[PDB]
């Protein structure tokens, strides 16, 4: 019961390899732990000495080996595809047709664009040829295929690690890669290791004293280097990332010869070689230089604006840092002088290279292409120990002022939302100034806070937030690991390396089995665990780090706590996010150049307004928090939530734990059965942790951070905007200037104000305990680079490669589903298009990997046995290019594998997947001249799906191909819940008749005479059946499904066999379309022009058996590409559509025009994507409860929806009654009084703009949207008192994105068009009548069962009080 992951997902920890070498007779010293030298060998790998294949492999190798840190760069160059590998068919054979597909897909893309109107004017006559050359001459092509063969072999090897099939042998030109279960031996020539002055390879310096390495390696020419299969996996990930990056750069040069936004592939290749050379000389330490790629790219970007003294100070500090690091790690390592000059080529290129800002921002996202250092447990505990045990000096006056501003910001947030002060129960004498404002019931302005600041300390008030606000119970089941309890803490280390057997076993360390095993689980019971300080009980004083993976820094760790303390943490995070943390909104994204001048000036009122920021690292705050600092804030959070000791838990628990790393093969040093109860401190473990842990109480710490930022704002007096994302916190200082000032002078002064704010904030936080290192924080005037999107003076820079290089034929899909893998590639392709101005590079990379996934799962599927041609057990005859290419052209919602929809280049969220998919399929078939193959591909045999599926996936069709494994997984979780879930509030939730109830609820929500799937889904989200579907949907890993202690215990057919059946059926569906076809539907669908009709009659025929003839409305929207046709215009010309129409003919259209102004351009105004204009980006309850619970809020929402939808019928209340009876103890009339349900309008249209889950974002960079004006007033009647299927927000996204696409490479001054009309195609749009739902019956189920279930119910919804108006 196991499944090796396809991609690297675990930290590269090589301590286990140290035992392997000892069994084989070799020698290695990966682990810093002396225990692994002389511990008893695990019986699993003790048998290597009995192996014949391993002995014959290492017979001609010295006892010495070398760390794989230094050999990884050698393998990345020495290894090629020219040798013999025991994999058939080789991945290299596929190449010849993968390219044939890639080119064909590129061709489709071009064809699509040709009919949408977004084709580049300049046509590269050899475009296909260039693609073919680029793909062939890529220098990591053959290496990538070879590394996929090695990954295939090592996956098979891991799956059957105990069987005889584990060993595999590969002989390249000069490298021998014999491999065991999850240990890979590499045999490499000594000659190709760089030497040191002493005459031994740089790898040997760490482990062997010279004259002992050369005596061990005496006559031998080859040496071995034992490494875990994870290193083979990450080298495969490196090589495929390098391949994507060089292919992407080359195809960009093909589509944009003048200046492509990606870094030139030659420079990137040189960077790769420099980095590998550096790694081959230094080791894992070399990453302490590779790590400076991103900061040096950010420096080099910033210097691309007007040069201000503090602009170069970023690059100077980074350059100094790089030199100091390079000297420190090479001081004690004897490098020959040649090597000293050449190890520096990496950062020397990073400094010299001159590139446009966009190129640098793409290069920024290659930082992980050199690898990830081999983490040690020891080097990752020293880091936290030095920052979490250090004593800190705090100025109370600053802690006092930060706390008062904390209260001030919570009072201010309460005032704005609730509209008045909270009931001040404290003495009015203690607040002489504040009580006057409270009496007038108005909040004091920001200038006068300075004198009244201390008064805030004395404000008191009753609880200001509810203790029951969690709605997604999945947080308590969300899959993860938790520390085992203290009595069995050492159960995580394996007994042979541990050296004694752990006296107490542990039941499980998994959170889902723990959640199901907890009988008395409830939110008030989590609180009673907290308030009663149960987390200080002996069994729960445990804590255990775990090295984070894919990190270039020497090991960075994330904490794990015992399951009950973990529930307390999740509750505190949920409580803060829904309540208090909303008082310090740190998501406020500020880009000053785009925002309107007036709103900006009134925003900085505390003329012109200028904003300059400085970005600090909030990640290092966590270790520096101290309880002397955090006590007031924590006490206040408790008093603000009406609890005691809840938000307090970390500083009471962590300081009293035995911090260590739960590393399977590296226990804390000197650990024995004698001192298991009182472990000794050592380099691996340390006792007192007076501090924070990363992630834990992220919501509280960010709140104290925004409190310090507001304290600096009060003191200094500038308008501060605080925004945090990931690890960095960017504080934008807005300073107001008089209008009659020099623009060059005001920028300088604004940057100076930012540096003054930074100095004050340094003083503040220094007093609070958090040292803001002034060297590594920089004052950026105009470069906003925190967060998802980087801006340079408001021109959005592209970071495409961070998602485009993650594409791969193998991904972590459920089982090894092709659809899951293809979907991942489709998602990476949508995102990468979004965040760059180049279409074809990422299209080529996603096509390449789509076909390569198909083939690689076709032969080498990991679930099926070796040599199991999945193409043969389904099709009987072998899958050819033809069948795959046609199964990749049928979009997934019709049932197929096409997840690369060209339309997603125009906009992200799609109005209707069926209509868009149909339009795509139609255009493809028109290209390849197989129109007649249309209807048959569409019309399939509808599957057998219940109404539950329809409600869970409204927009879809009832086609078995159009189905992801989620249903199957949810059925397995359901089975494991009904079988061995002892949780009380889950058994009550998942009672015996669960399935019957979900079916009844679903048939009902769809029993309305006009059926509206989306409304069904919306209510269902609030009904208890939606809560069951949320709890069930927690399984998304293949290893968890296939290896859980609570999943595989079922007495039915084993999971693996069911999975094989499902795989083979799915393959049958996808790749045999003639078989699974329905002729009736094919006759129904004949001779129908427009996609919307096809989609509606196909959608009604699929769900025929659930609809039973009742019409389905609110589920088909036109495919905007066919709805609107584009007519570009040269200046001083009118479009033919507007001329043919006398008055009414083709009149209605969306007008787009260019703006001549250019607010900002970097590097110049050559490309539309480089410049931004000034344009805008895009275009009641009677009694409101003061602290509504999640259940009450969902109840009100549910009631509001039901009333609004069923407004026509007079029995609305009789429809609402059952649902509210499972959720609140209110009469329907009471809730109706609490409902804001006073508005009315067209149900369908107002359901799509504001009630649809998708926000309809654009998939194209915002730089071109500001350069355009998009007027929808010329649509005539269809312009906004009218209702239509037109989705206005996507018409704007489509108009902008289309204009961007057509001119993404052309020079701006050469654009021969200034105006665009998106005219309405008559056939494919029509006015949607306003209707209303009319239920003719009521849900007869007695949902009152959930009265006891506090996850579902809400016993006393009016506890926190009520307010007027």
């Amino acid at each position: 019961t196991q499944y090796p992951d396809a991609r690297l997902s675990s930290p590269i920890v090589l301590d286990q390899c140290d035992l392997v070498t000892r069994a084989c007779g070799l020698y290695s010293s990966y682990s810093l732990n002396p225990q692994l030298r002389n511990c008893k060998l695990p019986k699993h790998i003790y048998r290597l000495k009995y192996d014949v294949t391993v002995t014959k492999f290492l017979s001609d190798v010295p006892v010495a080996t070398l760390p794989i840190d230094f050999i990884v760069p050698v393998l990345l160059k020495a290894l090629s595809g020219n040798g013999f590998c025991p994999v058939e068919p080789r991945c290299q054979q596929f190449l010849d047709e993968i390219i044939k597909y890639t080119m064909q897909d590129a061709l489709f893309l071009k064809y699509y664009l040709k009919n949408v109107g977004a084709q580049e004017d300049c046509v590269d006559e050899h475009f296909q040829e260039k693609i073919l050359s680029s793909i062939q001459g890529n220098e990591f092509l053959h290496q990538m295929f070879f590394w996929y063969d090695l990954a295939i072999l090592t996956r098979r090897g891991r799956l059957n690690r105990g069987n005889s099939r584990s060993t595999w042998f590969v002989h390249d030109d000069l490298i021998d890669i014999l491999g065991y279960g999850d240990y890979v031996f590499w045999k490499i020539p000594i000659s190709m290791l760089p030497l040191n002055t002493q005459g031994i390879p740089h790898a040997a310096m760490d482990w062997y004293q010279a004259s002992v390495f050369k005596e061990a390696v005496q006559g031998h020419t080859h040496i071995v280097s034992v490494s875990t299969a994870d290193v083979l996996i990450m080298c495969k990930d490196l090589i495929t990332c390098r391949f994507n990056t060089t292919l992407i750069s080359k195809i960009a040069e093909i589509e944009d010869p003048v200046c492509s936004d990606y870094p030139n592939f030659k420079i990137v290749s040189m960077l790769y070689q420099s980095g590998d050379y550096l790694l081959s000389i230094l080791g894992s330490d070399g990453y302490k230089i590779i790590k400076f790629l991103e900061p040096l790219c950010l420096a080099k970007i910033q210097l691309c604006s007007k040069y201000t003294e503090r602009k170069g100070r970023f690059l100077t500090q980074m350059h100094l840092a790089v030199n100091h690091t390079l000297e420190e790690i090479t001081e004690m390592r004897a490098l020959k002088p040649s090597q000293a000059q050449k190890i520096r080529e990496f950062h020397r290129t990073l400094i010299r290279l001159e590139m446009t800002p966009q190129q640098l921002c793409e290069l920024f996202s290659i930082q992980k292409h050199w690898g990830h250092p081999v983490l040690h447990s020891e080097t990752a505990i020293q880091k936290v120990k030095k920052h979490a045990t250090v004593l800190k000096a705090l100025r109370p006056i600053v802690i006092f002022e930060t706390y008062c501003v904390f209260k001030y910001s919570i009072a201010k947030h309460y005032f704005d939302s609730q509209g008045s002060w909270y009931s001040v129960t404290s003495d009015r004498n203690l607040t002489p100034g504040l009580n006057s404002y409270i009496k007038r019931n108005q909040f004091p302005p920001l200038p006068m806070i300075k004198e009244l600041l201390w008064e805030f300390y004395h404000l008191d008030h009753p609880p200001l937030f509810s203790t029951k606000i969690i709605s997604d119970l999945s947080i308590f089941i969300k899959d993860r690991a938790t520390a085992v309890e203290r009595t069995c803490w050492d159960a995580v280390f394996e007994p042979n390396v541990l050296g004694y057997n752990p006296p107490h076993k542990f039941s499980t360390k998994r959170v889902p089995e723990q959640f199901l095993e907890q009988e008395n689980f409830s939110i008030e019971n989590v609180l009673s665990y907290a308030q009663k300080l149960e987390y200080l009980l002996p069994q729960y004083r445990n804590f255990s780090f775990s090295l984070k993976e894919k990190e270039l820094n020497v090991g960075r760790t994330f904490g794990k706590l015992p399951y009950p303390t973990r529930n307390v943490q999740t509750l505190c995070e949920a409580l803060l996010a829904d309540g208090l943390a909303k008082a310090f909104p740190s998501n406020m994204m500020v880009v000053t150049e785009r925002e309107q001048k007036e709103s900006l000036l009134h925003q900085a009122s505390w003329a012109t307004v200028r904003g300059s920021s400085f970005v600090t690292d909030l990640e290092k705050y966590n270790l520096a928090f101290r309880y002397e600092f955090t006590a007031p804030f924590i006490e206040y959070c408790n008093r603000c939530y009406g609890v005691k000791n809840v938000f307090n838990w970390m500083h009471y628990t962590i300081p009293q734990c035995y911090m260590h790393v739960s590393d399977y093969y590296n226990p804390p040093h000197n650990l024995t059965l004698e001192n298991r109860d009182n472990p000794p401190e050592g380099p691996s473990s340390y006792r007192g942790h007076m501090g924070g842990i990363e992630g834990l109480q992220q919501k509280l710490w960010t709140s104290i951070s925004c409190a310090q930022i507001s304290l600096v704002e009060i003191k200094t007096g500038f308008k501060l905007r605080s925004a945090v994302m990931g690890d960095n916190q960017c504080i934008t200082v807005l300073s107001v200037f008089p209008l009659e000032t020099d623009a060059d002078e005001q920028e300088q002064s604004a940057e100076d104000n930012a540096a003054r704010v930074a100095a004050s904030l340094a003083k503040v936080t220094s007093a609070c305990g958090i040292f803001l290192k002034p060297d590594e924080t920089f004052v950026h005037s105009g470069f906003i680079y925190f967060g998802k999107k980087q801006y340079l003076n408001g021109v959005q820079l592209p970071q495409s490669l961070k998602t485009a290089t993650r594409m791969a034929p193998l991904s972590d899909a459920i089982f090894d589903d092709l659809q899951g893998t293809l979907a991942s590639i489709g998602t990476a392709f949508e995102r990468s298009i979004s965040e760059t101005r180049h279409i074809f590079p990422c299209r080529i990379t996603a096509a390449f990997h789509t076909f390569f996934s198909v083939r690689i799962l076709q032969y080498h599927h990991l679930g099926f046995n070796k040599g199991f041609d999945l193409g043969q057990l389904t099709l009987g005859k072998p899958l050819d290019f033809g069948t795959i290419s046609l199964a990749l052209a049928v979009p997934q919602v019709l049932g197929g594998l096409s997840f690369l929809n060209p339309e997603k280049c125009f906009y992200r969220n799609l109005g209707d997947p069926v209509t868009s998919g149909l339009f795509q399929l139609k255009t493809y078939l028109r290209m390849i001249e197989m129109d007649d193959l249309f209807l048959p591909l569409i019309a399939k045999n509808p599957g057998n799906c219940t109404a539950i599926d329809f409600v869970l996936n409204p927009s879809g069709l009832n086609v078995p191909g159009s189905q992801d494994l989620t249903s199957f997984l949810r059925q397995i979780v359901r089975r494991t819940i009904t079988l061995s879930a002892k949780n009380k509030l889950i058994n009550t939730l998942f009672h015996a008749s669960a399935d019957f109830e979900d079916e009844m609820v679903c048939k009902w929500l769809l029993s309305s005479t006009p059926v509206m799937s989306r409304f069904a889904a919306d209510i269902f989200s609030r009904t208890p059946s939606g809560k069951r579907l949320q709890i069930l949907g927690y399984l998304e890993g293949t290893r968890t499904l296939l290896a859980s202690k609570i999943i595989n215990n079922n007495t039915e057919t084993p999971v693996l066999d069911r999975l094989r059946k499902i795989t083979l059926q799915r393959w049958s569906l996808w790749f045999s379309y003639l078989d699974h076809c329905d002729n009736i539907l094919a006759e129904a669908l004949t001779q129908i022009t427009c996609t919307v009709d096809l989609a509606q009659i196909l959608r009604e025929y699929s769900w025929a058996h659930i609809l039973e003839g009742r019409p389905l409305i609110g589920a088909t929207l036109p495919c905007m590409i066919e709805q609107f046709k584009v007519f570009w215009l040269k200046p001083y010309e009118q479009c033919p559509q507007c001329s043919n129409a006398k008055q009414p003919g083709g009149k209605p259209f969306v007008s787009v025009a260019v703006k001549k102004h250019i607010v900002s351009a970097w590097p110049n105004a050559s490309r539309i994507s480089w410049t931004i204009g000034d344009g805008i980006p895009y275009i009641q309850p009677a009694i409101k409860p003061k602290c509504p619970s999640a259940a009450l809020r969902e109840a009100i929402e549910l009631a509001s929806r039901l009333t609004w939808v069923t407004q026509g019928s007079s029995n609305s209340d009789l429809l609402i009654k059952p649902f509210l009876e499972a959720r609140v103890n209110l009469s329907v009339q009471e809730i109706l009084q609490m409902t804001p349900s006073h508005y009315s309008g067209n149900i369908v249209h107002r359901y799509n703009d504001q009630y649809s889950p998708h926000s309809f974002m654009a998939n194209r960079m915002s730089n071109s949207a500001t350069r355009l004006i998009v007027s929808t007033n010329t649509l005539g009647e269809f312009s906004g008192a009218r209702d239509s299927n037109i989705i206005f927000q996507n018409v704007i996204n489509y108009a902008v994105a289309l204009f961007d696409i057509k001119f993404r490479n052309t020079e701006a001054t050469d654009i021969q068009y200034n105006r665009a009309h998106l005219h309405l195609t008559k056939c494919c749009t029509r006015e949607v009548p306003a209707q209303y739902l009319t239920y003719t019956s009521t849900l007869d189920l007695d949902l009152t069962r959930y009265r006891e279930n506090e996850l579902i119910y809400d016993s006393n919804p009016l506890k926190g009080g009520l307010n007027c108006n």
Binding site: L533, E628, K644, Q656, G688
Partner: protein, 56 residues
């Protein structure tokens, strides 16, 4: 007694002034001291089990 009022005003003003010139060093027992305090208040016994990190 206006003399007592002025005297108390002056003593308080001096204390507030001397507050801005304070510096404290975070200790190794603050978390444990607040834990003993929160456990004695809530349950009336000392925190159970092995000693906490820095007990008095």
């Amino acid at each position: 007694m206006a003399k007592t009022i002025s005297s108390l005003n002056r003593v308080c003003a001096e204390m507030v002034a001397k507050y801005d010139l304070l510096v404290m060093t975070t200790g190794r027992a603050t978390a444990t001291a607040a834990a003993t305090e929160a456990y004695w208040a809530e349950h009336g016994q000392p925190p159970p089990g092995p000693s906490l990190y820095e007990e008095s």
